[PDB]
Design brief:
- It is found in: Cell membrane; Mitochondrion inner membrane; Endosome membrane; Nucleus.
- It comes from Gallus gallus (Chicken).
- Belongs to the protein kinase superfamily. Tyr protein kinase family. SRC subfamily.
- There is one protein chain.
- It is built from ten helices and eight strands.
- The chain is an alpha+beta fold.
- It has two domains: 84 residues, Phosphorylase Kinase, domain 1; 170 residues, Transferase(Phosphotransferase) domain 1 (Transferase(Phosphotransferase), domain 1, Orthogonal Bundle).
- The protein has a five-stranded antiparallel sheet, with helices on one face. Strands 6-7-8 form a three-stranded antiparallel sheet.
- A hairpin with a 3-residue loop joins strand 2 and strand 3.
- Helix 4 packs antiparallel against helix 9 and helix 6 packs antiparallel against helix 8.
- The radius of gyration is 19 Å and the shape is globular.
- It binds ligand 1BU.
Length: 261
């Protein structure tokens, strides 16, 4: 009954983009011209209303850097329709075919954009809770919008959050820090060699990932700020954003392309 609603014939489903649990996700077309992402609910796997809270959140949160809702079909069988992103998941992009051509100049820009999506979230007093490369869509021209696949993310989760449920925009900040290391190691799992329980323990003793190879000390220092023990000493997304946009003039003016970054 809202103006997001569309006829069922406007949507063609072409390629299965992955069977999740509660339904499928499909690439396809809306009104026969527009490449579209389509989210299916398998009737009686989930309260309709509850599948549709996803669409409700994406109505309030609108930004050039957030994944964008286009339309809904809201009566069973339900469809949720959002913009297609040609490159898919950041994480697969980082570790696949484009992997090897990305350099520091492209990765900082991707991070610049994510921060920026995250700044809109900061301004809206929303909280992501699972910020990380698996939850970023990439599009044409290295465009990166913040997203959530519904998708235990402990290695990316601020300790106050993994320990005491204290999830805030500051614990999102901490994941951004980890996300930066996925960006700078081209998709590698952080804390290589460690396992969930030894991450919780060593991180609480103050251990942090060291500078990845070929990564400028100043980007790693930015990481290190994101990973301060105290939620409040962590930077805002507005700092992170401004800093990354300006990186190559203000912090690495002398920067020189290497084998991998
Ligand atoms: C579970 C849930 C519940 C409530 C809200 C959400 N949110 N929340 C957000 C924020 C907070 C950022 C606004 C976003 C979502 N939902 C969301 O991101 N949904 C969504 C929908 C489809 C996709 N999948 C693909 N999309 C677009 N192209 C592709 C191209 C390739 C491919 N493989 C997959 C895709 C990913 C995410 C999510």
């Amino acid at each position: 009954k809202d103006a997001w609603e569309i006829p069922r014939e406007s949507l063609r489903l072409e390629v299965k983009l992955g069977q999740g649990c509660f339904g499928e996700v499909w690439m396809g077309t809306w009104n026969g011209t527009t490449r579209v992402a389509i989210k299916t609910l398998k009737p009686g796997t989930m309260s309709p209303e509850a599948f549709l809270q996803e669409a409700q959140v994406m109505k309030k949160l609108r930004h050039e850097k957030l994944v964008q809702l286009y339309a809904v079909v809201s009566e069973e069988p339900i469809y949720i329709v959002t913009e297609y992103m040609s490159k898919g998941c950041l994480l697969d992009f980082l570790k696949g075919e484009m992997g090897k051509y990305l350099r520091l100049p492209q990765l900082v820009d991707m991070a610049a954009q994510i921060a920026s999506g995250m700044a809109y979230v900061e301004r809206m007093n929303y909280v992501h809770r699972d910020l990380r490369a698996a939850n970023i869509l990439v599009g044409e021209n290295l465009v990166c919008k913040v997203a959530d696949f519904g998708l235990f993310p402990i290695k990316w989760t601020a300790p106050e959050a993994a320990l005491y449920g204290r999830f805030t925009i500051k614990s999102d900040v901490w994941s951004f820090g980890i996300l930066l290391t996925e960006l700078t190691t081209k998709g590698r799992v952080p804390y290589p060699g460690m396992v969930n329980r030894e991450v919780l323990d060593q991180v609480e003793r103050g251990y942090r990932m060291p500078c990845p190879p070929e990564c400028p000390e100043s980007l790693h220092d930015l990481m290190c700020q994101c990973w301060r023990k105290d939620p409040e000493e962590r930077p805002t997304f507005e700092y992170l954003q401004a800093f990354l946009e300006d990186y190559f003039t203000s912090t690495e003016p002398q920067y020189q392309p290497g084998e991998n970054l």
